[PDB]
């Protein structure tokens, strides 16, 4: 939708195909800090967005923004290190351009990760929250990636989202966590997207808690939306990098320029979590 | 406001006038599926949007999108078959362009219909919900049809909406329903507009229920807003085409590509409901 | 961010500097009706937006829209009479352009006033509500002034807002109110921004009350956001000009074209409130 035409996607995917011998099945999208997951791929083939045809280039930050094709624990992946966000200024049709390319590349599963602040008090920074559902606040106002004329070549005008985050994949991630003897249980909740780059205020934090969100972030939802729109199996998770402040006594103050949590404890715990899951993603071959 | 100037409206309305001998009093806007209401007009004069001067043409769908001037049960109408929506990509000033044209055509009443999913559990698919009020979610973020410099020739900078849906008309619709011996009572609630084309997720569904909405749709509100802004008496209703899924056990999944409900039971029940109401719309002549 | 470059701000501020001998410390932004506060400045030097370089000109209303440099109770001010709003059509980067200019002018404190309707029932029209916090509804959808690439020359990509409204300034405003023997206590609450020019509907009014807002307005928040983003000490207040209607029995109807409240009782009570506070704003010299 908008700005890009089917041809564009078709050309980016083809150029990609004719530039890598890897035919990816699973596309992983690395959220803030969770980028080194690319390091553990094998037969890795790296493309910086910039060199790829119709691919949105990353803003100012020339310290990342690449598409790494590889193999992770048996699965042929394609990892987008450094996602695009609304705050950077991108129209959602750009933010989610890669998700449609992945589809044309043959990807049938998209696992999206992100760093989210925590609204549910049981969460603790470092916790990993499996996304059971989302609340797409921007989409309410009209900030939806599917806006504009619908290309029946990708999907429906009115795709359903009640079933976004794969019920099976979630089942497995939970088990996989247990069979890792973790102690701190895999959390499960609802991720709420908020666009603006600034961080929540206590009042905002409280409306989000009342609305039913468990984690608040500034990404993922547009991708999940267009993935599901074109059929991709979606599974994703949030890394609780910080308890959002719900009291005026606050004292503490939200900081991103502290993308620690993610690179800290998480860095490993999560990238290994992701690897074993590759095993749990059904092979397009499977059968028995 | 924006994109169109007073002249534009003035010209479209005039060209219309000088192209139909009908001087409409009531303008009806047919929501999804509820379009055949046009079939029951008499002295019908059809104009496909396309042939009308500054009239937003419908997107891809070349299977409808027309303005039918006629007489319905004594009233001289003008029905817009196939409304415009945000999801199609239209700026709200286009979505609502026809409402201002209607005003310049002499229309003093606008009855808007739509197909809405149901958040209130007492509703049943097929139920007709009289709109007692709305929650304009997009307008909160800035997606308001009145945005931009205000033309005092149409109305106020800051029009009030506490009184949108005519209190009288509602009274009458209720009575009219009774004097039709219906059994299933005319429901009454608050319609919440959500823009994006995709359907709600369970979490989204739950925030809407908590927010106070009874039905959720993707239209009507911009029209009501600009109608009321220029003085039009507004009365409208929702056809509950589906109970939105509020549980994760879901199983069922929202489908539009099932615009059945509307064409089913509703098709008639509602178009006849609309006809008797023409009688209840006060004549610009009336007096006693 | 967007539309304007650092140079632009730098040039507007410089031209300003080289056109006034006043080096302002406190920048006050006058909300609807609260504009005559400019009248009480001394050594007043007036610039109508229009004559200032990259300064957004006011829309149609040629009956105000000026920047008045002066001295108020000892402090060297710069008052923006007539703020810019989203409803007028301005992109937030324009609405908030002056806030960045103020920063480059040397301003270290921004006090924003506005006229807000009241959702909390304890409030009474005429009441002054100190803003303890805000809920930036537009920013949720993406309507954030910081959107677009972040200029590290002004601030952070992800500034925090949990601490927006200065805790000290609030303490003082309260005391200052007491030492004015007012009787009707200075209220304190959360201001919720709503963009659209139209007024709330009862359902909308109720979701705002449920969301936790105390007052609803159509300004201030973008300014507070970019002020805080570039470090300005922010303190602001709402003048409850009208109890927003929370019942369907309504009868009454919201009117702006009744900017009375503000010019009435408030006109004075508030502008004198503002003057004594100048005394309470710490001098960039201070020390003991
Ligand atoms: N809105 C929001 N985004 C957060 C929070 N914690 C982490 N994030 C995420 O990290 C980046 C900002 O550091 C982008 C956003 O996806 C939070 O508390 N609130
Ligand atoms: N958002 C939303 N729109 C709905 C729903 N049911 C019917 N609709 C309405 O029908 C069309 C999509 O089929 C456009 C929208 O006005 C629903 O459950 N949710
Ligand atoms: N949304 C809203 N803005 C209000 C209200 N009362 C005052 N206002 C404020 O005054 C102007 C409209 O008259 C712009 C807005 O900042 C109110 O009840 N609702």
mmCIF file of C-alpha atoms in Angstrom, chain A:
data_model
loop_
_atom_site.group_PDB
_atom_site.id
_atom_site.type_symbol
_atom_site.label_atom_id
_atom_site.label_comp_id
_atom_site.label_asym_id
_atom_site.label_seq_id
_atom_site.Cartn_x
_atom_site.Cartn_y
_atom_site.Cartn_z
ATOM 1 C CA UNK A 1 0.000 0.000 0.000
ATOM 2 C CA UNK A 2 0.863 3.655 -0.788
ATOM 3 C CA UNK A 3 4.183 4.926 -2.096
ATOM 4 C CA UNK A 4 5.145 1.404 -3.184
ATOM 5 C CA UNK A 5 3.500 -0.689 -5.854
ATOM 6 C CA UNK A 6 3.404 -4.473 -6.150
ATOM 7 C CA UNK A 7 6.148 -4.219 -8.750
ATOM 8 C CA UNK A 8 8.448 -2.480 -6.226
ATOM 9 C CA UNK A 9 8.113 -5.273 -3.706
ATOM 10 C CA UNK A 10 8.428 -7.825 -6.486
ATOM 11 C CA UNK A 11 11.640 -6.188 -7.683
ATOM 12 C CA UNK A 12 13.266 -5.832 -4.260
ATOM 13 C CA UNK A 13 12.495 -9.466 -3.410
ATOM 14 C CA UNK A 14 13.801 -10.677 -6.794
ATOM 15 C CA UNK A 15 16.977 -8.634 -6.645
ATOM 16 C CA UNK A 16 17.412 -10.038 -3.161
ATOM 17 C CA UNK A 17 16.842 -13.600 -4.435
ATOM 18 C CA UNK A 18 19.260 -13.090 -7.318
ATOM 19 C CA UNK A 19 21.819 -11.867 -4.761
ATOM 20 C CA UNK A 20 21.747 -14.509 -2.119
ATOM 21 C CA UNK A 21 21.526 -18.248 -2.454
ATOM 22 C CA UNK A 22 19.651 -18.360 0.820
ATOM 23 C CA UNK A 23 15.872 -18.746 0.413
ATOM 24 C CA UNK A 24 14.763 -17.701 3.922
ATOM 25 C CA UNK A 25 11.821 -19.358 5.720
ATOM 26 C CA UNK A 26 11.834 -17.435 8.941
ATOM 27 C CA UNK A 27 12.319 -13.662 9.034
ATOM 28 C CA UNK A 28 13.357 -12.328 12.436
ATOM 29 C CA UNK A 29 13.124 -8.651 13.270
ATOM 30 C CA UNK A 30 15.514 -7.514 15.974
ATOM 31 C CA UNK A 31 14.305 -4.926 18.386
ATOM 32 C CA UNK A 32 16.474 -2.364 20.158
ATOM 33 C CA UNK A 33 19.651 -3.912 21.532
ATOM 34 C CA UNK A 34 18.564 -7.434 20.513
ATOM 35 C CA UNK A 35 20.555 -7.014 17.285
ATOM 36 C CA UNK A 36 23.535 -9.246 17.983
ATOM 37 C CA UNK A 37 21.228 -12.213 17.356
ATOM 38 C CA UNK A 38 22.576 -11.841 13.864
ATOM 39 C CA UNK A 39 26.001 -12.780 15.173
ATOM 40 C CA UNK A 40 24.916 -16.376 15.800
ATOM 41 C CA UNK A 41 23.744 -17.072 12.233
ATOM 42 C CA UNK A 42 25.797 -19.387 10.012
ATOM 43 C CA UNK A 43 26.510 -19.039 6.285
ATOM 44 C CA UNK A 44 25.742 -15.375 7.010
ATOM 45 C CA UNK A 45 25.242 -13.062 4.076
ATOM 46 C CA UNK A 46 24.885 -9.387 5.046
ATOM 47 C CA UNK A 47 23.221 -6.612 2.968
ATOM 48 C CA UNK A 48 23.034 -3.123 4.276
ATOM 49 C CA UNK A 49 19.569 -1.704 3.525
ATOM 50 C CA UNK A 50 21.130 1.000 1.481
ATOM 51 C CA UNK A 51 22.399 -1.381 -1.213
ATOM 52 C CA UNK A 52 19.006 -3.048 -1.569
ATOM 53 C CA UNK A 53 16.768 -1.564 -4.294
ATOM 54 C CA UNK A 54 13.627 -0.007 -2.842
ATOM 55 C CA UNK A 55 14.706 -0.526 0.740
ATOM 56 C CA UNK A 56 14.106 2.383 3.173
ATOM 57 C CA UNK A 57 17.531 3.523 4.322
ATOM 58 C CA UNK A 58 18.049 4.005 8.062
ATOM 59 C CA UNK A 59 18.003 7.648 9.265
ATOM 60 C CA UNK A 60 21.188 9.412 10.562
ATOM 61 C CA UNK A 61 22.414 6.310 12.465
ATOM 62 C CA UNK A 62 25.118 4.943 10.206
ATOM 63 C CA UNK A 63 26.050 2.509 13.015
ATOM 64 C CA UNK A 64 23.641 -0.262 11.850
ATOM 65 C CA UNK A 65 20.696 -1.016 9.609
ATOM 66 C CA UNK A 66 21.297 -4.270 7.699
ATOM 67 C CA UNK A 67 19.537 -7.417 6.446
ATOM 68 C CA UNK A 68 21.483 -10.604 7.377
ATOM 69 C CA UNK A 69 20.585 -13.828 5.531
ATOM 70 C CA UNK A 70 21.700 -17.029 7.205
ATOM 71 C CA UNK A 71 20.985 -20.257 9.016
ATOM 72 C CA UNK A 72 20.024 -20.324 12.671
ATOM 73 C CA UNK A 73 19.754 -23.728 14.404
ATOM 74 C CA UNK A 74 18.676 -25.475 11.233
ATOM 75 C CA UNK A 75 16.304 -22.823 9.908
ATOM 76 C CA UNK A 76 17.182 -20.579 6.974
ATOM 77 C CA UNK A 77 16.658 -17.061 8.339
ATOM 78 C CA UNK A 78 16.677 -13.444 7.219
ATOM 79 C CA UNK A 79 17.206 -11.012 10.069
ATOM 80 C CA UNK A 80 16.523 -7.324 9.895
ATOM 81 C CA UNK A 81 18.962 -5.752 12.308
ATOM 82 C CA UNK A 82 17.551 -2.413 13.246
ATOM 83 C CA UNK A 83 13.866 -1.976 12.488
ATOM 84 C CA UNK A 84 12.252 1.248 11.282
ATOM 85 C CA UNK A 85 9.989 3.232 13.566
ATOM 86 C CA UNK A 86 7.303 5.882 13.202
ATOM 87 C CA UNK A 87 9.257 8.355 15.381
ATOM 88 C CA UNK A 88 12.125 8.371 12.868
ATOM 89 C CA UNK A 89 9.576 9.901 10.491
ATOM 90 C CA UNK A 90 8.819 6.974 8.198
ATOM 91 C CA UNK A 91 5.329 6.551 6.839
ATOM 92 C CA UNK A 92 4.114 3.155 8.042
ATOM 93 C CA UNK A 93 4.191 1.890 4.437
ATOM 94 C CA UNK A 94 7.948 2.253 4.637
ATOM 95 C CA UNK A 95 8.293 0.921 8.199
ATOM 96 C CA UNK A 96 6.637 -2.273 6.988
ATOM 97 C CA UNK A 97 8.111 -2.460 3.473
ATOM 98 C CA UNK A 98 10.456 -5.206 4.513
ATOM 99 C CA UNK A 99 7.652 -7.382 5.802
ATOM 100 C CA UNK A 100 6.132 -7.629 2.333
ATOM 101 C CA UNK A 101 9.525 -8.273 0.759
ATOM 102 C CA UNK A 102 9.984 -11.182 3.169
ATOM 103 C CA UNK A 103 6.689 -12.579 2.043
ATOM 104 C CA UNK A 104 7.789 -12.444 -1.591
ATOM 105 C CA UNK A 105 11.073 -14.055 -0.578
ATOM 106 C CA UNK A 106 9.118 -17.041 0.649
ATOM 107 C CA UNK A 107 9.147 -16.295 4.400
ATOM 108 C CA UNK A 108 6.242 -17.987 6.180
ATOM 109 C CA UNK A 109 7.040 -16.998 9.689
ATOM 110 C CA UNK A 110 7.947 -13.687 11.156
ATOM 111 C CA UNK A 111 9.214 -13.399 14.681
ATOM 112 C CA UNK A 112 9.430 -9.809 15.860
ATOM 113 C CA UNK A 113 11.251 -8.776 18.957
ATOM 114 C CA UNK A 114 11.305 -5.378 20.650
ATOM 115 C CA UNK A 115 12.315 -3.632 23.853
ATOM 116 C CA UNK A 116 9.299 -2.533 25.810
ATOM 117 C CA UNK A 117 8.721 -0.708 29.024
ATOM 118 C CA UNK A 118 6.561 -2.556 31.559
ATOM 119 C CA UNK A 119 3.136 -1.430 32.760
ATOM 120 C CA UNK A 120 2.207 -4.661 34.449
ATOM 121 C CA UNK A 121 3.891 -4.644 37.909
ATOM 122 C CA UNK A 122 4.645 -8.386 37.995
ATOM 123 C CA UNK A 123 7.116 -7.794 35.210
ATOM 124 C CA UNK A 124 10.691 -7.018 36.112
ATOM 125 C CA UNK A 125 13.238 -5.378 33.903
ATOM 126 C CA UNK A 126 14.960 -8.193 32.064
ATOM 127 C CA UNK A 127 11.765 -10.272 31.918
ATOM 128 C CA UNK A 128 10.760 -11.520 28.486
ATOM 129 C CA UNK A 129 7.115 -11.084 27.663
ATOM 130 C CA UNK A 130 5.619 -13.263 24.937
ATOM 131 C CA UNK A 131 3.187 -11.131 22.948
ATOM 132 C CA UNK A 132 -0.263 -12.695 23.268
ATOM 133 C CA UNK A 133 -1.884 -9.600 21.753
ATOM 134 C CA UNK A 134 -1.513 -5.899 20.894
ATOM 135 C CA UNK A 135 -3.488 -2.644 21.039
ATOM 136 C CA UNK A 136 -2.689 -0.604 18.006
ATOM 137 C CA UNK A 137 -3.244 2.922 19.309
ATOM 138 C CA UNK A 138 -1.945 4.630 16.143
ATOM 139 C CA UNK A 139 -4.153 2.477 13.959
ATOM 140 C CA UNK A 140 -7.218 3.785 15.810
ATOM 141 C CA UNK A 141 -6.456 7.310 14.562
ATOM 142 C CA UNK A 142 -5.695 6.114 11.049
ATOM 143 C CA UNK A 143 -2.041 5.231 11.356
ATOM 144 C CA UNK A 144 -2.441 1.836 9.852
ATOM 145 C CA UNK A 145 -0.014 0.244 7.384
ATOM 146 C CA UNK A 146 -2.894 -1.159 5.325
ATOM 147 C CA UNK A 147 -4.343 2.306 4.700
ATOM 148 C CA UNK A 148 -4.917 3.154 1.119
ATOM 149 C CA UNK A 149 -6.222 0.956 -1.663
ATOM 150 C CA UNK A 150 -5.808 -2.786 -0.794
ATOM 151 C CA UNK A 151 -3.769 -5.021 -3.048
ATOM 152 C CA UNK A 152 -5.594 -8.303 -3.226
ATOM 153 C CA UNK A 153 -2.211 -9.764 -4.312
ATOM 154 C CA UNK A 154 -1.034 -9.523 -0.711
ATOM 155 C CA UNK A 155 -4.306 -9.858 1.090
ATOM 156 C CA UNK A 156 -7.705 -8.673 2.146
ATOM 157 C CA UNK A 157 -9.070 -5.156 2.406
ATOM 158 C CA UNK A 158 -10.179 -5.940 5.938
ATOM 159 C CA UNK A 159 -7.814 -8.539 7.401
ATOM 160 C CA UNK A 160 -8.642 -9.868 10.897
ATOM 161 C CA UNK A 161 -6.239 -9.497 13.813
ATOM 162 C CA UNK A 162 -7.999 -11.387 16.612
ATOM 163 C CA UNK A 163 -5.558 -14.179 15.657
ATOM 164 C CA UNK A 164 -2.352 -12.223 15.051
ATOM 165 C CA UNK A 165 0.143 -13.839 17.326
ATOM 166 C CA UNK A 166 0.226 -17.555 16.507
ATOM 167 C CA UNK A 167 -1.411 -19.692 19.175
ATOM 168 C CA UNK A 168 0.835 -22.708 18.389
ATOM 169 C CA UNK A 169 4.133 -20.857 18.399
ATOM 170 C CA UNK A 170 3.206 -19.392 21.778
ATOM 171 C CA UNK A 171 2.464 -22.841 23.170
ATOM 172 C CA UNK A 172 5.906 -23.998 22.048
ATOM 173 C CA UNK A 173 7.825 -20.942 23.246
ATOM 174 C CA UNK A 174 6.428 -21.590 26.709
ATOM 175 C CA UNK A 175 7.510 -25.229 26.704
ATOM 176 C CA UNK A 176 10.874 -24.362 25.175
ATOM 177 C CA UNK A 177 11.358 -21.937 28.084
ATOM 178 C CA UNK A 178 10.597 -24.623 30.632
ATOM 179 C CA UNK A 179 13.069 -26.991 28.904
ATOM 180 C CA UNK A 180 15.805 -24.441 29.497
ATOM 181 C CA UNK A 181 15.229 -24.574 33.272
ATOM 182 C CA UNK A 182 14.860 -20.814 33.575
ATOM 183 C CA UNK A 183 13.313 -20.127 37.008
ATOM 184 C CA UNK A 184 12.027 -16.675 35.946
ATOM 185 C CA UNK A 185 8.928 -17.560 33.906
ATOM 186 C CA UNK A 186 8.251 -16.432 30.391
ATOM 187 C CA UNK A 187 5.711 -13.680 30.832
ATOM 188 C CA UNK A 188 2.697 -13.241 28.561
ATOM 189 C CA UNK A 189 0.760 -10.069 27.940
ATOM 190 C CA UNK A 190 -0.516 -7.390 25.562
ATOM 191 C CA UNK A 191 1.857 -4.996 23.883
ATOM 192 C CA UNK A 192 0.551 -1.470 23.278
ATOM 193 C CA UNK A 193 2.137 0.627 20.567
ATOM 194 C CA UNK A 194 2.622 4.310 21.192
ATOM 195 C CA UNK A 195 4.270 6.235 18.330
ATOM 196 C CA UNK A 196 5.895 9.467 19.477
ATOM 197 C CA UNK A 197 9.629 9.217 20.402
ATOM 198 C CA UNK A 198 9.183 10.788 23.829
ATOM 199 C CA UNK A 199 8.519 8.533 26.791
ATOM 200 C CA UNK A 200 5.250 8.186 28.656
ATOM 201 C CA UNK A 201 4.288 10.539 31.467
ATOM 202 C CA UNK A 202 2.801 9.099 34.598
ATOM 203 C CA UNK A 203 -0.741 9.918 33.486
ATOM 204 C CA UNK A 204 -0.094 8.392 30.119
ATOM 205 C CA UNK A 205 1.439 5.402 31.847
ATOM 206 C CA UNK A 206 -1.701 5.011 33.892
ATOM 207 C CA UNK A 207 -4.122 5.190 30.950
ATOM 208 C CA UNK A 208 -2.079 2.474 29.237
ATOM 209 C CA UNK A 209 -2.295 0.301 32.376
ATOM 210 C CA UNK A 210 -6.050 0.903 32.518
ATOM 211 C CA UNK A 211 -6.419 0.197 28.801
ATOM 212 C CA UNK A 212 -5.106 -3.288 29.390
ATOM 213 C CA UNK A 213 -1.559 -3.139 28.091
ATOM 214 C CA UNK A 214 1.259 -5.025 29.766
ATOM 215 C CA UNK A 215 4.107 -3.537 27.846
ATOM 216 C CA UNK A 216 4.368 -0.308 25.837
ATOM 217 C CA UNK A 217 6.674 0.102 22.903
ATOM 218 C CA UNK A 218 7.051 2.065 19.751
ATOM 219 C CA UNK A 219 7.197 -0.620 17.136
ATOM 220 C CA UNK A 220 6.210 -4.154 16.136
ATOM 221 C CA UNK A 221 2.501 -3.562 15.520
ATOM 222 C CA UNK A 222 2.745 -2.145 12.046
ATOM 223 C CA UNK A 223 4.897 -5.177 11.048
ATOM 224 C CA UNK A 224 2.568 -7.713 12.693
ATOM 225 C CA UNK A 225 -0.311 -6.041 10.918
ATOM 226 C CA UNK A 226 1.095 -6.284 7.412
ATOM 227 C CA UNK A 227 2.600 -9.756 8.084
ATOM 228 C CA UNK A 228 -0.752 -11.117 9.083
ATOM 229 C CA UNK A 229 -2.310 -9.283 6.184
ATOM 230 C CA UNK A 230 -0.235 -11.305 3.791
ATOM 231 C CA UNK A 231 -0.501 -14.520 5.750
ATOM 232 C CA UNK A 232 2.793 -14.722 7.641
ATOM 233 C CA UNK A 233 2.785 -16.745 10.863
ATOM 234 C CA UNK A 234 3.726 -14.155 13.473
ATOM 235 C CA UNK A 235 5.239 -14.792 16.887
ATOM 236 C CA UNK A 236 7.045 -12.097 18.781
ATOM 237 C CA UNK A 237 8.267 -10.980 22.165
ATOM 238 C CA UNK A 238 9.050 -7.997 24.287
ATOM 239 C CA UNK A 239 12.104 -7.586 26.502
ATOM 240 C CA UNK A 240 10.986 -5.555 29.560
ATOM 241 C CA UNK A 241 13.824 -3.070 29.621
ATOM 242 C CA UNK A 242 12.303 -0.844 32.272
ATOM 243 C CA UNK A 243 9.324 -0.514 34.588
ATOM 244 C CA UNK A 244 7.482 2.530 33.340
ATOM 245 C CA UNK A 245 6.921 4.993 36.221
ATOM 246 C CA UNK A 246 3.333 4.860 37.557
ATOM 247 C CA UNK A 247 3.738 7.147 40.570
ATOM 248 C CA UNK A 248 4.296 10.826 40.909
ATOM 249 C CA UNK A 249 6.839 10.158 43.663
ATOM 250 C CA UNK A 250 8.707 8.856 40.588
ATOM 251 C CA UNK A 251 12.239 10.014 41.407
ATOM 252 C CA UNK A 252 13.538 7.723 38.641
ATOM 253 C CA UNK A 253 13.068 8.874 35.013
ATOM 254 C CA UNK A 254 12.724 6.891 31.760
ATOM 255 C CA UNK A 255 15.957 6.594 29.732
ATOM 256 C CA UNK A 256 16.615 4.879 26.377
ATOM 257 C CA UNK A 257 20.093 6.226 26.325
ATOM 258 C CA UNK A 258 20.459 3.257 28.697
ATOM 259 C CA UNK A 259 19.793 0.477 26.146
ATOM 260 C CA UNK A 260 21.510 -1.650 28.760
ATOM 261 C CA UNK A 261 18.853 -4.127 29.811
ATOM 262 C CA UNK A 262 18.749 -5.448 26.278
ATOM 263 C CA UNK A 263 22.526 -5.862 25.902
ATOM 264 C CA UNK A 264 22.780 -6.919 29.505
ATOM 265 C CA UNK A 265 21.223 -10.155 30.830
ATOM 266 C CA UNK A 266 18.954 -10.280 27.786
ATOM 267 C CA UNK A 267 21.657 -10.276 25.075
ATOM 268 C CA UNK A 268 22.260 -13.961 25.641
ATOM 269 C CA UNK A 269 19.245 -15.362 27.441
ATOM 270 C CA UNK A 270 17.117 -14.123 24.589
ATOM 271 C CA UNK A 271 19.253 -14.903 21.559
ATOM 272 C CA UNK A 272 19.577 -18.516 22.756
ATOM 273 C CA UNK A 273 15.819 -18.578 23.430
ATOM 274 C CA UNK A 274 15.339 -17.585 19.798
ATOM 275 C CA UNK A 275 17.688 -20.351 18.499
ATOM 276 C CA UNK A 276 15.947 -23.296 20.144
ATOM 277 C CA UNK A 277 12.661 -21.941 18.809
ATOM 278 C CA UNK A 278 13.926 -22.289 15.232
ATOM 279 C CA UNK A 279 13.585 -26.009 15.902
ATOM 280 C CA UNK A 280 9.979 -25.497 16.919
ATOM 281 C CA UNK A 281 9.039 -23.597 13.708
ATOM 282 C CA UNK A 282 7.372 -26.192 11.459
ATOM 283 C CA UNK A 283 9.277 -26.943 8.296
ATOM 284 C CA UNK A 284 7.419 -26.059 5.070
ATOM 285 C CA UNK A 285 8.244 -29.731 4.399
ATOM 286 C CA UNK A 286 7.460 -31.276 7.847
ATOM 287 C CA UNK A 287 4.775 -34.054 7.342
ATOM 288 C CA UNK A 288 4.757 -36.308 10.467
#
